């Protein structure tokens, strides 16, 4: 539905990428999600503020993701990719689901040399 800047990270094989994504929503925040769409839409990590963290199929997302709250009330949703290989490139995006309906996504393009 709605988009929220987001850049192109130009990285070198072996780098570390720290993609962060914030929303102010609390009352109407249903879930946060990290997805990698390349030729798949691949769900990496799904966090629900009451039901906890859930990893998408094939993924070890528990160690690479985090959701914390700023006391100015913003929720930080973050994905960390370590020692990125040539294959980790492609379109990462962060999708917030709001109540009762809408979606706010932020798209990150990781381009590896």
């Amino acid at each position: 539905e709605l988009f929220n800047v987001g850049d192109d990270v130009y990285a070198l094989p072996g780098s570390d990428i720290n993609l962060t994504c914030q929303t102010k929503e609390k009352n109407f925040l249903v879930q946060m999600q990290w997805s990698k769409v390349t030729d798949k839409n691949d769900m990496i990590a799904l966090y629900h503020p009451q039901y906890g963290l859930y990893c998408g199929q094939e993924h070890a997302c528990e160690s690479q993701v985090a959701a914390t709250e700023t006391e100015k009330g913003v929720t930080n949703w973050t994905l960390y990719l370590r020692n990125i290989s040539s294959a980790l490139g492609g379109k990462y995006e962060c999708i917030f689901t709001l109540y009762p309906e809408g979606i706010k996504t932020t798209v990150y393009n990781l381009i590896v040399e």
Epitope: Y54, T97, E101
Partner: antibody
Framework: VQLKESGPGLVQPSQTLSLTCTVS????????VSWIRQPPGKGLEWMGV???????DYNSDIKSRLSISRDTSKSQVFLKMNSLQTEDTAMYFC????????????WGQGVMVTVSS | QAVVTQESALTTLPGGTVTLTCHSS?????????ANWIQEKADHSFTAILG???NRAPGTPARFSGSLLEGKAALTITGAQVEDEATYFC?????????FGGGTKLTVKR
């Protein structure tokens, strides 16, 4: 990724039923496990859920008798139900990531538990 | 907390498309009801078909799709195959209690 339910096959209207759902190859910290039962002839009844984060929610008609807990070190969820009645004989299924998040949804095979003297 | 009703029975030819729906007594279904569908065949056999409104479960063929249409959640098979003749149960989530519908009886005329 395999779900196996195990528990007593026949338990008398005296006891407390205890089944345990054991999940291979996944940490219960990023998966939730729910218990659904279906007495023969009757419809499905959801009983409760243990979320990835350890919280729980129960069916309001069984909340008082039902306890769902987990052991993240053995990757197992337990159900204990006191005040066994004779209807409580049913097929007992566990389903992971059900109802939430409903992605990676998978429903075990079920274990028959018959409650009669 | 509400009553979930589905179509009692539906029929198609192979290659047809049918849409089963799943109605919430309590108003229009939001994604926050996490509608899901499991398929029953013989023998106390349940297969997870689709969950979280639109996510196919591991193994579910591509003909299975889910959506929110009208005031309800909807499972749509596109190109029904004879193997899809089954009873389909939907269930809805009402912030703490999960209520199942009665199950639709999909017949696919081989």
């Amino acid at each position: 990724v395999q779900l196996k339910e195990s528990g007593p096959g026949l338990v008398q209207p005296s006891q407390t039923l205890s089944l345990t759902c054991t999940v291979s190859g996944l940490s219960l910290t990023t998966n939730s496990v729910s218990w659904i039962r279906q007495p023969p002839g009757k419809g499905l009844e959801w009983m409760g859920v243990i979320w990835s984060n350890g919280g729980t929610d129960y069916n309001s008609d069984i909340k008082s008798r039902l306890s769902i807990s987990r052991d993240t070190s053995k990757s197992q969820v337990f159900l204990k139900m006191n005040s066994l009645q004779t209807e409580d004989t049913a097929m007992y299924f566990c389903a992971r990531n059900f109802p939430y998040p409903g992605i990676n949804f998978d429903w075990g095979q079920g274990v028959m538990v018959t409650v009669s003297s | 907390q509400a009553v979930v009703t589905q179509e009692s029975a539906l029929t198609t030819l192979p290659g047809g498309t049918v849409t089963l729906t799943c109605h919430s007594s309590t108003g229009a279904v939001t994604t926050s009801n996490y509608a899901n569908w499991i398929q029953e065949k013989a023998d106390h056999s349940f297969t997870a078909i689709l969950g979280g409104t639109s996510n196919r479960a591991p193994g579910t063929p591509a003909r299975f799709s889910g959506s929110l249409l009208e005031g309800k959640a909807a499972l749509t098979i596109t190109g029904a195959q004879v193997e899809d003749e089954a009873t389909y149960f939907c269930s809805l989530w009402y912030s703490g209690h999960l209520i199942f519908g009665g199950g639709t009886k999909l017949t696919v005329k081989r």
